[PDB]
Amino acid sequence: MKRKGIILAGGSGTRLHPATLAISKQLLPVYDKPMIYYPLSTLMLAGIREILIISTPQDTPRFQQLLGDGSNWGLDLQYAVQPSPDGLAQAFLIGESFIGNDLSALVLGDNLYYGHDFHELLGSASQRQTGASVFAYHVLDPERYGVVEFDQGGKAISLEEKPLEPKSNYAVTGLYFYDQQVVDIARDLKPSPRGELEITDVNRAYLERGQLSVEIMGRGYAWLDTGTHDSLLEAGQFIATLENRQGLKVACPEEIAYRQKWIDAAQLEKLAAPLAKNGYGQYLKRLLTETVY
Amino acid sequence: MKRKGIILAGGSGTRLHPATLAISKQLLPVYDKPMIYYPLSTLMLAGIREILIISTPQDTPRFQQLLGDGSNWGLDLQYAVQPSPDGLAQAFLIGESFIGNDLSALVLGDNLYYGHDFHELLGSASQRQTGASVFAYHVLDPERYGVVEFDQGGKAISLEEKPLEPKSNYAVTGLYFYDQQVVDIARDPSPRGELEITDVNRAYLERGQLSVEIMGRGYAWLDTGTHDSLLEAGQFIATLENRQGLKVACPEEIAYRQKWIDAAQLEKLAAPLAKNGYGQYLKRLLTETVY
Amino acid sequence: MKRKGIILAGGSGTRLHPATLAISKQLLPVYDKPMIYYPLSTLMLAGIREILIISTPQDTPRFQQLLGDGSNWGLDLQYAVQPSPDGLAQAFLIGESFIGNDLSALVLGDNLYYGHDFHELLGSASQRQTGASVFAYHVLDPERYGVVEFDQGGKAISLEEKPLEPKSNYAVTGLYFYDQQVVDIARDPSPRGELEITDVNRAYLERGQLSVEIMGRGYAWLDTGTHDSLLEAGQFIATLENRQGLKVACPEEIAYRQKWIDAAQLEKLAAPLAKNGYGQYLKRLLTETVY
Amino acid sequence: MKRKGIILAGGSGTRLHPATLAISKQLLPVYDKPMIYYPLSTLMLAGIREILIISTPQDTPRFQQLLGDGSNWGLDLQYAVQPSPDGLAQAFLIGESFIGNDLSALVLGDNLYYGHDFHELLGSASQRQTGASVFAYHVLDPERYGVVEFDQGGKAISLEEKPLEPKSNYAVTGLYFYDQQVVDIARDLKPSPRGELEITDVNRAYLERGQLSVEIMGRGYAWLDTGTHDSLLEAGQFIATLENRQGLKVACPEEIAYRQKWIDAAQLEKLAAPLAKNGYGQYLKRLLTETVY
Ligand SMILES: O=C1CC(=O)N(CCc2ccccc2)C(=O)N1
Ligand SMILES: O=C1CC(=O)N(CCc2ccccc2)C(=O)N1
Ligand SMILES: O=C1CC(=O)N(CCc2ccccc2)C(=O)N1
Ligand SMILES: O=C1CC(=O)N(CCc2ccccc2)C(=O)N1
Ligand SMILES: [Cl-]
Ligand SMILES: [Cl-]
Ligand SMILES: [Cl-]
Ligand SMILES: [Cl-]
């Protein structure tokens, strides 16, 4: 069965103004590439090629102008708008006809993931054709997230959205896998007390049916979010340190598509040409004539 | 006499791609505000209110959308396009009718300055109504800049553009003050195929009309031209702002302190942004004395 | 009249353990040099050559091993021990016979200052031979410091130590100048069980002898008291040094520029370090003019 | 068969002066703990409890004063001096009687490792009772390291120490596993043209006998070194970003010994007591009453 992807690139409102008066949030760079390359790479590493980008009416054309239809990277990218920021779970109503009767995956536009065998840790989630899969990650400030409570045998028994009194330090990360029920679950939701269709309510719905798999994303993975000026900066420094140490890029879509066999050596060479003058083009050119294990 | 300002916010080419496939370099943020706010604040701190922004045809509307005509901040901002990146000295040909018969000042769009009594160090340059003024600053890699050589008595005797063998570690920073002769000097290419600002400055030096002031080690002059240096500049500005609770290069603040806009106008500007830290900061400025 | 200096480099307790189980906080490096070089350079920039370092019994030998008696840098460094951390004002009782009948200056061991004409901003404080002088600096978290309140005409009217409800955002920085009365003021505990420097400063304020000078936003005053702030201060100093090719708080440099040691002495100091960047930097200073 | 560990904490000379006039290099902190906690944690994660720390005559007592005999953390730590920095391979001559007839592992004192299932990636190396095991890692500046060349089928065929013209971008990291031959291999070495007993010559000796296993440490691992002022700073920022995001520490020996079952809850509580006032003590206390997966 096919799995489709959605990237939710919502409007951060005026919270990052005036930086985001110039460019949309998920167009801001993290070190050396646009923020949106990171969640796109995550979907690509899960084996997902068919992807809907959802953003504001102002920002959608800008994502389109940047990314096109994805064919240069062996992807099929489509676009849709969220007129009003009425909660993340709206992505499934907006995305209803894109999803059709297929399996899906949702990723937040400002989330970055780094670590080992990331290709394989997503594989187990992506292959599960029934129910929902999410990842829990130990954090210092769980109040800011969806928080998962486990019983004494490590079984997930409760999910709470931004609790004032968190039950654990396990946050739910911004990457979600769903089966064919998610659209119908979303339509039956009622708005929260904040006036939003919450993704945690979608996840609670699967939990109450005993169909939520909660996998642990271990301490040896980096899950970062780029939602404040401070966290964007930190994420920049983190990616720069890795790239400058390794001479290998994090979340380079051209590279990921080449290694996945979605584009070939000739196509990668064409992509490198316009950028040959700068470090990013030189990097893509180097990939053709080097074995990276 | 009036002094007009020019900000050269040109096409970064492909050097910062793909980050700048989203936008021109001078729209990228340095920590919490667009790059272009920093050179704009420098011009404002020199007392300059009438400013021409020069950028690519593609980027001009984006600067316009960000900054408008400047009237909200007591400024008069105008725009011009540079079809092709043919050297920094082209700013005076493109900007010829904007400048008219007035004094001018040119600043590069990716330069940031921080330090003490900055308002006052620019004052002496801005109020000199004859000849040209530039600033020299000790750097580690002078080969990347215009380099000034001094004689034993501290007099400038030579300028060189990006020398492979620099004569000193004094770079000429990206801020230049000119009198009414600069357009005519400019109208009169290098081996690289560009109209060099260093040739304009050499022209003033050879007629004995170049003031070279030292910008001391207690000032920060940073360049935001690479991915690495943009990140560094971000960390630097964050550290200062988070330490002080005072912003670097907030134009609304600078206009308010210059008396270009008043308390009521500042309050209006703060309203739309009230929900975020930047709006809250502008609101706090109304009810606090900063010395 | 002579002014003597004191650096309080006391026991950080257990707050930075286990990092400081290796050494006292003021021996940790800020980027490329020990923390203590920064407050020592501040005292030197004020013209102070005779300096008492106060630290724990365990740490004193380590400071001594690092710094010696100071003669290599044209200084006279003396050491005293603080058995117990009983407040910053204890420095004047411990330091009583070192001070004698002279003027004094106290600096905290984990404070760093950067900015323009810093030599000259300290000069006005250092040369005031009567009363006390402190500096006020706008900060984001004034609750962590001594806080000064000003009246409508910018006169200091109140000082409070770590107030839960600060009257302003002006903190008193960790650098203090005193006349001959401070020892007697000091000899005359808070609810926390400590001899507070803010009580010493209040005493001078109540006799109308406290000069409170503003350290403006164009200066950097950083505190290296947490793991996070020490890291930030490191990044800040690295950015400046790597931009300029000039060091912050290099005592050998400061002594050379103050004329306390000469070219031959500086060359001797550079020899043992010739293999690393710090030695190479001292060697470069001999054959370059820095304005 | 037992495996013993050596941490080489050598004298960086005057290269980091004057910072290292106050404290020895491997006593400098990386963010919130002494540099040496990081390579010690690496050895502990390989299951090694018996460890020799080698450093200069000036620095050895300082390591002793910091770490003791290791019994508080369920370790057995011993100390030895290297009078003169005559190459890293000297560690096996100095360490000869400590090693005895056992298997060994050498780790450099200024190397930091971060990533997933790190416990398990070392397990395969630690269990190999014959020959030597090293790790290769893609880097940007391979000239600074021991560089491994691979043939077309991914077999290691050459090792070069700091080559002017590197054959690949695969550096050998500062962690080495050896069998009972390493002492004898080291004694038969001749000094290099630089006047040092090189670890690369020890590794070449195993390669020429076909007994060098070279495993790839993938791009999803962070291998950092803390040998310059700049790299020490970068490593600090990197560790701070991870710790402040996760509320979990990197390379906390007390934690690693507790999770390995080398010390128990009561012993961990005793260790936390003296430090209760600060964040590190509070962290150890929190570990007693939380499940970390
Ligand atoms: O940020 C990344 C993470 C990553 O794992 N990779 C390697 C991905 C890969 C490897 C082999 C087969 C298929 C895919 C990457 O190019 N960039
Ligand atoms: O980035 C800055 C640097 C600065 O100096 N200032 C102070 C400006 C000022 C102008 C006129 C009278 C008094 C103060 C600022 O608001 N932002
Ligand atoms: O950290 C610093 C800050 C500073 O201003 N200086 C310049 C000191 C000086 C002293 C006397 C005459 C001229 C210059 C320095 O060498 N290191
Ligand atoms: O820097 C680290 C890396 C690490 O993996 N861990 C967990 C280690 C562990 C887990 C389970 C059983 C045995 C050991 C750690 O405490 N600190
Ligand atoms: Cl893990
Ligand atoms: Cl200066
Ligand atoms: Cl100032
Ligand atoms: Cl990997």
**All structural domains of chain C:** 1-291 (3.90.550.10)
Which H or E element spans position B221?
strand B220-223
- Chain D residues whose CB is inside 8 A of the C27 CB are 22-23
**Sequence-distant (≥ 6) Cβ neighbours of residue D163 within 8 angstroms:** D142, D143, D147
For residue B230, report the phi and psi dihedrals to the nearest 5 degrees: -65, -45
Query: Rounded distance, CA B21 to CA A137, Å?
Result: 33
- Is A251 annotated as ligand-binding? yes
Does the beta carbon of C260 lie inside 6 Å of ligand 3? no
**Sequence-distant (≥ 6) Cβ neighbours of residue D152 within 8 angstroms:** none
Query: Rounded distance, CA D282 to CA A116, Å?
Result: 30
Lookup: tokens for B84: 């092709």
The CA distance from A45 to the nearest CA of chain B, in Å, is 20
Minimum CA distance residue for ligand 1 atom 12: A259
Query: Rounded distance, CA C210 to CA C146, Å?
Result: 14
Partner residue facing A17 (CB), from B19, B62, B273: B273
Cβ of D132: how many Cβ atoms within 10 Å? 24
CA atoms within 13 A of residue B119's CA, in its CB half-sphere: 11
Q: Which ligand is nearest to the CA of B33?
A: 2
What would the 3-class secondary structure string for B46-92 be? Answer: CCCCEEEEEECCCCHHHHHHHHCCCHHHCCEEEEEECCCCCCHHHHH
Which H or E element spans position C130?
none
Lookup: tokens for A97: 């006809």
Measured between alpha carbons, how far is residue A180 from residues A6, A47, A132, A206 in Å?
A: 14, 18, 10, 12
Tell how far the Cα of C214 is from the centroid of ligand 7, in angstroms: 9
For residue D89, report the phi and psi dihedrals to the nearest 5 degrees: -70, -20
Residue B58 gets the label, from left (phi > 0), alpha (psi -120 to 50) or beta, of alpha
**Sequence-distant (≥ 6) Cβ neighbours of residue B253 within 8 angstroms:** B247, B282, B285
Lookup: tokens for A59: 């920002």
Q: For a ligand 1 pocket test, name from A40, A120, A126, A255 the mutation site with the most ligand atoms within 8 angstroms of its C-beta.
A: A255
* Helix, strand and coil percent figures for chain C, each rounded to 5: 40, 25, 40
Tell how far the Cα of C105 is from the centroid of ligand 1, in angstroms: 59
The breaks in chain D (C to N more than 2.5 Å) occur after none
Q: Which atom of ligand 3 is nearest to the CA of C258?
A: 11
Minimum CA distance residue for ligand 4 atom 12: D259
**Sequence-distant (≥ 6) Cβ neighbours of residue B206 within 8 angstroms:** none
Tell how far the Cα of C117 is from the centroid of ligand 6, in angstroms: 5
Query: Rounded distance, CA D222 to CA D241, Å?
Result: 13
Please give the residue of chain A at the shortest CA–CA distance from B26: A22
Partner residue facing D18 (CB), from C28, C33, C62: C33
Please give the residue of chain A at the shortest CA–CA distance from D153: A291
**3-state class (DSSP) for residue D156:** strand
CA atoms within 13 A of residue C90's CA, in its CB half-sphere: 19
Instruction: Specify which residues B45 forms β-bridges with.
Output: none
The verdict on a CB contact (< 8 Å) between B291 and C214 is yes
- Chain A residues whose CB is inside 8 A of the B33 CB are 18-19
Does the beta carbon of D255 lie inside 6 Å of ligand 4? yes
The verdict on a CB contact (< 8 Å) between B21 and A240 is no
Does the beta carbon of B253 lie inside 6 Å of ligand 2? yes
Nearest in space to A109 (alpha carbons), one of A11, A17, A254, A8: A8
Lookup: tokens for B175: 């801020």
Residue C100 gets the label, from left (phi > 0), alpha (psi -120 to 50) or beta, of left
- C contact chains, 3+ CB pairs < 8 A: B, D
Query: Rounded distance, CA C216 to CA D203, Å?
Result: 59
Output b/e per residue, C178-198; b: 16+ Cβ within 10 A: bbebbbebbeeeeeeebbbbb
**3-state class (DSSP) for residue B215:** coil
- A contact chains, 3+ CB pairs < 8 A: B, D
Lookup: tokens for B32: 């919490």
Nearest in space to C280 (alpha carbons), one of D14, A168, D26, D142: D14
CA atoms within 13 A of residue D283's CA, in its CB half-sphere: 22
In one letter, which amino acid is C219?
Y
Residue C155 gets the label, from left (phi > 0), alpha (psi -120 to 50) or beta, of beta
Q: State whether the Cα torsion D72-D73-D78-D81 is positive or negative.
A: negative
Which of D15, D28, D226, D229 should one mutate to test binding to chain C, selecting the residue with the greatest count of C CBs within 10 A? D229
The approach used to solve this structure was: X-ray
Q: Which of residues 85-104 of B touch C (CB under 8 A)?
A: none
Q: Say if CB C135 and CB C242 are below 8 A apart.
A: no
Does the beta carbon of D260 lie inside 6 Å of ligand 4? yes
Tell how far the Cα of D246 is from the centroid of ligand 8, in angstroms: 20
CA angle D250, D254, D255 (to 5 degrees): 55
The breaks in chain C (C to N more than 2.5 Å) occur after 188
| Residue numbering of the annotated binding site of B for dTTP | 10, 12-15, 25-26, 82, 87, 110, 115-119, 218, 249
Q: Say if CB C177 and CB C126 are below 8 A apart.
A: yes
Query: Rounded distance, CA C255 to CA C252, Å?
Result: 5
Query: Rounded distance, CA C270 to CA C278, Å?
Result: 8
Instruction: Specify which residues B7 forms β-bridges with.
Output: B53, B107
- Chain B residues whose CB is inside 8 A of the C114 CB are 218
In one letter, which amino acid is B184?
D
Q: Say if CB D31 and CB D130 are below 8 A apart.
A: no
Q: Which ligand is nearest to the CA of D254?
A: 4
Query: Rounded distance, CA B61 to CA A217, Å?
Result: 44
CA angle D143, D194, D163 (to 5 degrees): 20
Q: State whether the Cα torsion A67-A71-A74-A80 is positive or negative.
A: positive
DSSP string, A4-21: EEEEEE---TTTTTTHHH
Does the beta carbon of D35 lie inside 6 Å of ligand 4? no
Nearest in space to B173 (alpha carbons), one of B207, B214, B218: B214
CA atoms within 13 A of residue D131's CA, in its CB half-sphere: 15
**Sequence-distant (≥ 6) Cβ neighbours of residue A143 within 8 angstroms:** A162, A163, A164, A166
Tell how far the Cα of C44 is from the centroid of ligand 3, in angstroms: 9
Minimum CA distance residue for ligand 1 atom 8: A256
The CA distance from A187 to the nearest CA of chain B, in Å, is 31
Tell how far the Cα of D149 is from the centroid of ligand 1, in angstroms: 22
Measured between alpha carbons, how far is residue D281 from residues C76, C182, C232, D67, D255 in Å?
A: 40, 39, 23, 17, 11
The CA radius of gyration of chain B, in Å to the nearest whole number, is 19
The verdict on a CB contact (< 8 Å) between A290 and D169 is yes
In one letter, which amino acid is D293?
Y
Query: Rounded distance, CA D14 to CA B57, Å?
Result: 55
Query: Rounded distance, CA C159 to CA B270, Å?
Result: 32
Query: Rounded distance, CA B213 to CA B173, Å?
Result: 11
Partner residue facing C239 (CB), from B137, B150, B236: B236
- Is D13 annotated as ligand-binding? yes
Q: Cα A130 vs. chain centroid, distance in angstroms?
A: 21
Q: Which ligand is nearest to the CA of C112?
A: 3
- D contact chains, 3+ CB pairs < 8 A: A, C
The CA distance from D27 to the nearest CA of chain C, in Å, is 6
- Is D100 annotated as ligand-binding? no
D274 touches chain C (CB under 8 A): yes
Does the beta carbon of B249 lie inside 6 Å of ligand 2? yes
Nearest in space to D157 (alpha carbons), one of D218, D217, D212: D212
The verdict on a CB contact (< 8 Å) between C276 and D15 is yes
Lookup: tokens for A158: 């409760």
The CA distance from C223 to the nearest CA of chain B, in Å, is 9
The verdict on a CB contact (< 8 Å) between D277 and C15 is yes
DSSP category for residue D120: H
- Chain B residues whose CB is inside 8 A of the A31 CB are 19, 227, 231
For residue C222, report the phi and psi dihedrals to the nearest 5 degrees: -120, 150
Q: Say if CB D238 and CB D257 are below 8 A apart.
A: no
Which of A36, A232, A233, A244 should one mutate to test binding to chain B, selecting the residue with the greatest count of B CBs within 10 A? A233
| Pairing assessment for the beta strands D103-108 and D170-178 based on DSSP bridges | antiparallel
- Is A115 annotated as ligand-binding? yes
Which H or E element spans position C71?
none
Query: Rounded distance, CA D122 to CA D113, Å?
Result: 11
The breaks in chain B (C to N more than 2.5 Å) occur after 188
Lookup: tokens for A103: 């399996």
| Pairing assessment for the beta strands D76-81 and D50-55 based on DSSP bridges | parallel
Q: Say if CB B141 and CB B39 are below 8 A apart.
A: no
**Sequence-distant (≥ 6) Cβ neighbours of residue C280 within 8 angstroms:** C274
Query: Rounded distance, CA C115 to CA C274, Å?
Result: 29
- Chain C residues whose CB is inside 8 A of the D280 CB are 17-18
Query: Rounded distance, CA A85 to CA C275, Å?
Result: 60
The CA distance from D256 to the nearest CA of chain A, in Å, is 13
Q: Which of residues 144-163 of C touch B (CB under 8 A)?
A: 150, 154
Which H or E element spans position C89?
none
Does the beta carbon of B112 lie inside 6 Å of ligand 2? no
Q: State whether the Cα torsion D162-D167-D169-D173 is positive or negative.
A: negative
Cβ of B40: how many Cβ atoms within 10 Å? 28
Q: What burial class does residue C102 get, using C-beta atoms within 10 Å of its C-beta: 0-12 exposed, 13-18 middle, 19+ buried?
A: middle
Which of C217, C237, C254 should one mutate to test binding to chain B, selecting the residue with the greatest count of B CBs within 10 A? C217
Query: Rounded distance, CA A95 to CA A178, Å?
Result: 13
Q: What resolution in angstroms, rounded to 1 decimal?
A: 2.1
The H-assigned helical ranges of C22-117 are 37-45, 60-67, 91-94, 96-99
Measured between alpha carbons, how far is residue B234 from residues A100, A234, B55, D209 in Å?
A: 44, 10, 23, 52
